[PDB]
């Protein structure tokens, strides 16, 4: 039961469940590169989700729902995290470091690349730590689709309450980390807020990215990658 984990047991576990590092393998060519990478990452995201404290306590239907609702936001936060140390660049994969102008290969892509670069620059100046990063990524998984759960079932309501309590623990964990980092109580509250407010920006970029992917899909410029198509369809 995730509710028993201590702050350190929570973080250490999240850090150990991190997905493995993957390498990537015109407008269509660009879209192919990104969608191919996302499809492959999704397989590992599913394995990772299973290890997020509390995720497997949910019904299979609810696990599916959370992943359908947060997948792109999770790929994106991982991307801004990797891109931290590379000012002005987006590190999609160790062998795929793209500059802002690279986004011009695709109509409407520079816009989202700019938002991604902005968030990365933001995490950099804030000096986001990996312990914090993994907590944020888990929060996204749990928070995104919880309010879209059915409200017409006692079991669904209990599922929502369970997720909310696990989310509370992750909150204590984040506070704990900032505490030992030497932050005052005021700095802790402020930093926790800044981080959670960024999650709001990520949800926005994800929504914009999704609309972009669907529009390209419609232009038939998206390869038939079955899992990616499944996740896209869920939106």
């Amino acid at each position: 039961l995730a509710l028993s984990l201590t702050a350190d047991q929570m973080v250490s576990a999240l850090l150990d469940a991190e997905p493995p590092i993957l390498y990537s393998e015109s407008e269509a060519s660009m879209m192919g590169l990104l969608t191919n990478l996302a499809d492959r990452e999704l397989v590992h995201m599913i394995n990772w989700a299973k290890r997020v404290p509390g995720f497997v306590d949910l019904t299979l239907h609810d696990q599916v729902h959370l992943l359908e609702c947060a997948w792109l936001e999770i790929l994106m936060i991982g991307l801004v995290w990797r891109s931290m140390e590379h000012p002005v660049k987006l590190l999609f994969a160790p062998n795929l470091l793209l500059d802002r102008n690279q986004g011009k290969c695709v109509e409407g892509m520079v816009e989202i690349f700019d938002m991604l670069l902005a968030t990365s620059s933001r995490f950099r100046m804030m000096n986001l730590q990996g312990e914090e990063f993994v907590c944020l990524k888990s929060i996204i998984l749990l928070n995104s689709g919880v309010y879209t759960f059915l409200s017409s079932t006692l079991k669904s309501l209990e599922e929502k309450d369970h997720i909310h309590r696990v989310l509370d623990k992750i909150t204590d964990t984040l506070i704990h980390l900032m505490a030992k980092a030497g932050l005052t109580l005021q700095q802790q509250h402020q930093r926790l807020a800044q981080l959670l407010l960024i999650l709001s920006h990520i949800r926005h970029m994800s929504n914009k990215g999704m609309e972009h992917l669907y529009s390209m899909k419609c232009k038939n410029v998206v390869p038939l990658y079955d899992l990616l198509l499944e996740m896209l369809d869920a939106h």
Partner: peptide
């Protein structure tokens, strides 16, 4: 959804 369902199981 079938692939997601399979991988999760």
């Amino acid at each position: 959804h079938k692939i997601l369902h399979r991988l999760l199981q």
